[PDB]
Amino acid sequence: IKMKSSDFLESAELDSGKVSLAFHRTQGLMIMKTVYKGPNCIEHNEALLEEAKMMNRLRHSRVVKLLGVIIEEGKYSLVMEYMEKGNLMHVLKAEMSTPLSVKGRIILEIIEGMAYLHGKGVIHKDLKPENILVDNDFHIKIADLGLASFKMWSKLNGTLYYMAPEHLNDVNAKPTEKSDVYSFAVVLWAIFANKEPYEQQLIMAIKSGNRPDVDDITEYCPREIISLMKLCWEANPEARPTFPGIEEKFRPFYLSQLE
Numbered sequence: 521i522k523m524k525s526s527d528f529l530e531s532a533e534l535d536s537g538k539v540s541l542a543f544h545r546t547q548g549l550m551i552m553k554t555v556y557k558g559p560n561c562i563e564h565n566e567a568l569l570e571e572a573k574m575m576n577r578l579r580h581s582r583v584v585k586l587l588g589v590i591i592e593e594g595k596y597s598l599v600m601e602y603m604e605k606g607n608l609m610h611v612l613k614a615e616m617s618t619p620l621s622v623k624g625r626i627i628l629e630i631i632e633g634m635a636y637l638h639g640k641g642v643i644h645k646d647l648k649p650e651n652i653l654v655d656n657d658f659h660i661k662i663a664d665l666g667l668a669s670f671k672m673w674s675k676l677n678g679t680l681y682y683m684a685p686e687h688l689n690d691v692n693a694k695p696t697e698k699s700d701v702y703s704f705a706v707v708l709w710a711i712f713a714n715k716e717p718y719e720q721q722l723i724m725a726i727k728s729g730n731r732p733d734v735d736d737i738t739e740y741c742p743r744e745i746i747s748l749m750k751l752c753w754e755a756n757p758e759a760r761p762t763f764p765g766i767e768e769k770f771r772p773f774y775l776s777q778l779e
């Protein structure tokens with residue numbers, strides 16, 4: 521979990537807040553983001569190392585790995601694995617259109633990764649294209665760049681279009697697995713529409729049954745996927761499926777008609 525800046529042979533800052541792509545001696549490339557600068561705390565310094573070892577042990581191919589933490593002379597930084605193509609929305613807004621087979625695979629990988637997290641008792645709450653990272657081979661990893669699951673590191677220093685209606689104007693309602701199912705539905709829309717969807721007048725529209733316009737999807741999208749996004753953004757959370765439920769229907773569909 522613990523790391524030093526001496527371990528990094530070279531680095532390079534980039535802004536996608538701001539991060540450093542550092543080459544580690546033996547492990548290779550890693551992304552680095554300094555959370556806060558100033559004095560070294562005492563009340564919460566011990567917990568920040570425990571919270572990192574809790575996220576470090578979330579080990580799945582479709583989930584971003586926290587590689588370590590760097591604490592040195594009043595600075596606090598998190599170190600994750602490098603994903604070469606950035607985020608899903610960066611990939612979707614490129615010159616060339618991503619094939620339907622690759623989009624179908626991204627969808628299945630987000631399902632695999634979200635079923636993993638739910639099975640480990642972790643609710644995402646902040647699932648959006650910006651938290652779906654892409655490597656140079658078009659395989660994805662679900663991240664937590666907004667620190668929604670890092671409650672300690674969040675205290676050391678967002679998008680409403682993917683947020684389920686039950687959480688719009690009811691911030692005390694505890695987020696559930698069905699909260700993420702709603703967000704995934706809006707991510708499905710964004711994958712085939714190739715853009716971000718859609719304040720008080722909007723939000724109140726979403727609570728009454730308003731959703732992103734499916735007719736805005738110009739490029740080809742399968743009817744079973746359209747049917748899946750409609751079911752996942754159902755206003756009632758109990759009417760939505762679980763990610764293992766989505767997986768048992770989506771995987772046979774991907775393998776027969778898209779792979």
Ligand SMILES: CN1C(=O)[C@@H](NC(=O)c2cc(Cc3ccccc3)on2)COc2ccccc21
Pocket residue numbers: 537539551552553575576578583584585586598599600637642644662663664665666669
């Ligand atoms: C350097 N850096 C990071 O290390 C980031 N780590 C994660 O997002 C992360 C998520 C998980 C596992 C995990 C995934 C999904 C839900 C819950 C849990 O493990 N690590 C955090 O802060 C950054 C912010 C911006 C840019 C870069 C970073």
